[PDB]
């Protein structure tokens, strides 16, 4: 996260860390959507242009964390994956379209102050909230500059108009993404950066005061470059696949 601040304790209790076993290293962020499911970006797991193809045993999910590097004793829980589901039509060859994957935990995690799932959006929350100007919140332990934080970082970013997102890049944008960020003139900054992928973009409903996850940190060129924007998997557009996966397995 570039130009964000330290998180408060308990502030994002769904924030999950994707952790390589060997070498032990932060892979990606991710989110806790139930006691058994974690939602992340598919390019965290499988991205052939970089010879990236992780499996269940390559990976540990650490939940409850605040510190990036410490093992937080009595606070975090570390679990192993039982199964990994990548969207059948994730498009890594061209534009990372349908950048989404679900991971099944081998055993359910227990909730506490520091560990609590986020909500997934319904049609009319999505409609109400996914508007240009509306700010959502991205969190992660990735780089601070296009070096790395001690502690979870957070930043708040406005949704950007669809045409503005398209004229900011050569890459072909689809209905399964949206872009967030400040215009160069608005004189505020902020962006995800390496290591933040897979992370939750969330919004608080004013109607019921719950936190919903509308986006997955997906892709962007550079970090916090003027005139560029971050791009996020559009979680509602792909909830049908999510529901399926969850209530099939």
């Amino acid at each position: 996260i570039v130009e964000g601040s330290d998180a408060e304790i308990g502030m994002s209790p769904w924030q999950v860390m994707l952790f390589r076993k060997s070498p032990q290293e932060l892979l990606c962020g991710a989110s806790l959507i139930s006691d058994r499911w974690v939602l992340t970006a598919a390019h965290c797991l499988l991205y052939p242009p970089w010879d990236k193809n992780f499996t269940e045993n390559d990976l540990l999910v650490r939940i409850g964390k605040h510190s990036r590097t410490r093992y937080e004793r009595n606070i975090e829980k570390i679990s192993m994956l039982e199964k990994i589901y990548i969207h059948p039509r994730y498009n890594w060859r061209e534009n990372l379209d349908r950048d989404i994957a679900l991971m099944k935990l081998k055993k359910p995690v227990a909730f506490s102050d520091y560990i609590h799932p986020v909500c997934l959006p319904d049609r009319e929350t999505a409609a109400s909230l996914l508007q240009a100007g509306y700010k959502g919140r991205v969190t992660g332990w990735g780089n601070l500059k296009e070096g790395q934080p001690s502690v979870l970082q957070v930043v708040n970013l406005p949704i950007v108009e669809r045409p503005v997102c398209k004229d900011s890049t050569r890459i072909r944008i689809t209905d399964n993404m949206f872009c967030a960020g400040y215009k160069p003139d608005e004189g505020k900054r902020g962006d995800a950066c390496e290591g933040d992928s897979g992370g939750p973009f969330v919004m608080k409903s004013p109607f019921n005061n719950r936190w919903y996850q509308m986006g997955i940190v997906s892709w962007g060129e550079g970090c916090d470059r003027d005139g560029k924007y971050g791009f996020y998997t559009h979680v509602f557009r792909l909830k049908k696949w999510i529901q399926k996966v969850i209530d099939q397995f």
Binding site: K21, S22, Q24, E25, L26, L60, T69, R70, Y71, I78, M80, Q148
Partner: peptide, 11 residues
Amino acid sequence: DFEEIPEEYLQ
């Protein structure tokens, strides 16, 4: 950089 985790997990 990363603090070593319990080996119960790395099993």
